[PDB]
Amino acid sequence: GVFTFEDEITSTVPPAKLYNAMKDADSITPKIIDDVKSVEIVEGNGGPGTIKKLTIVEDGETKFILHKVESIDEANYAYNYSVVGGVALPPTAEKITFETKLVEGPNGGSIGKLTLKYHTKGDAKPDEEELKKGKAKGEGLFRAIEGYVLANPTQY
Numbered sequence: 001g002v003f004t005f006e007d008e009i010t011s012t013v014p015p016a017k018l019y020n021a022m023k024d025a026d027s028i029t030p031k032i033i034d035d036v037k038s039v040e041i042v043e044g045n046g047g048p049g050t051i052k053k054l055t056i057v058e059d060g061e062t063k064f065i066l067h068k069v070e071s072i073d074e075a076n077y078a079y080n081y082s083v084v085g086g087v088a089l090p091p092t093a094e095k096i097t098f099e100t101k102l103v104e105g106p107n108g109g110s111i112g113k114l115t116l117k118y119h120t121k122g123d124a125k126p127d128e129e130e131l132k133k134g135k136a137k138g139e140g141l142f143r144a145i146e147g148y149v150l151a152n153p154t155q156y
């Protein structure tokens with residue numbers, strides 16, 4: 001089946017600035033997030049269909065995660081990707097998609113609309129553990145990119 005979850009987060013950063021920064025996430029996330037060590041493009045031009053390999057060290061163990069870029073809509077401040085291999089993908093799941101969309105806040109800040117879609121193989125049940133881990137990932141990225149912009153005011 002498909003399980004869909006929707007969430008919102010807020011930032012004082014205007015959406016156009018945040019979105020520019022999101023485009024540099026491969027560069028930014030290893031600096032801010034302790035566990036991420038590198039992000040490498042296995043193949044692709046960074047657009048839809050690109051495959052990325054993330055190298056992380058978790059619990060003193062090196063591991064890898066695979067991402068695939070689904071779609072990009074700059075006019076709409078959206079970036080979509082799916083987890084398609086690695087530890088992040090549970091055995092039951094076909095695929096886990098994270099959609100990120102940025103909207104102007106009422107006060108000029110930003111609202112991040114985060115949608116998580118969990119595709120399960122057959123009738124398998126989604127792991128609660130993964131979802132909990134899942135909601136954090138959607139947030140952490142956003143915070144990572146936000147923190148970086150706030151800490152480097154002149155750059156964006």
Ligand SMILES: Oc1cc(O)c2c(c1)O[C@H](c1ccc(O)c(O)c1)[C@H](O)C2
Pocket residue numbers: 025026029033035036039054056065137140141
């Ligand atoms: O705290 C974490 C832990 C993780 O395993 C990850 C986190 C944050 O965010 C990473 C991340 C997510 C999206 C990206 O585009 C990216 O470059 C890096 C990834 O989800 C894997």
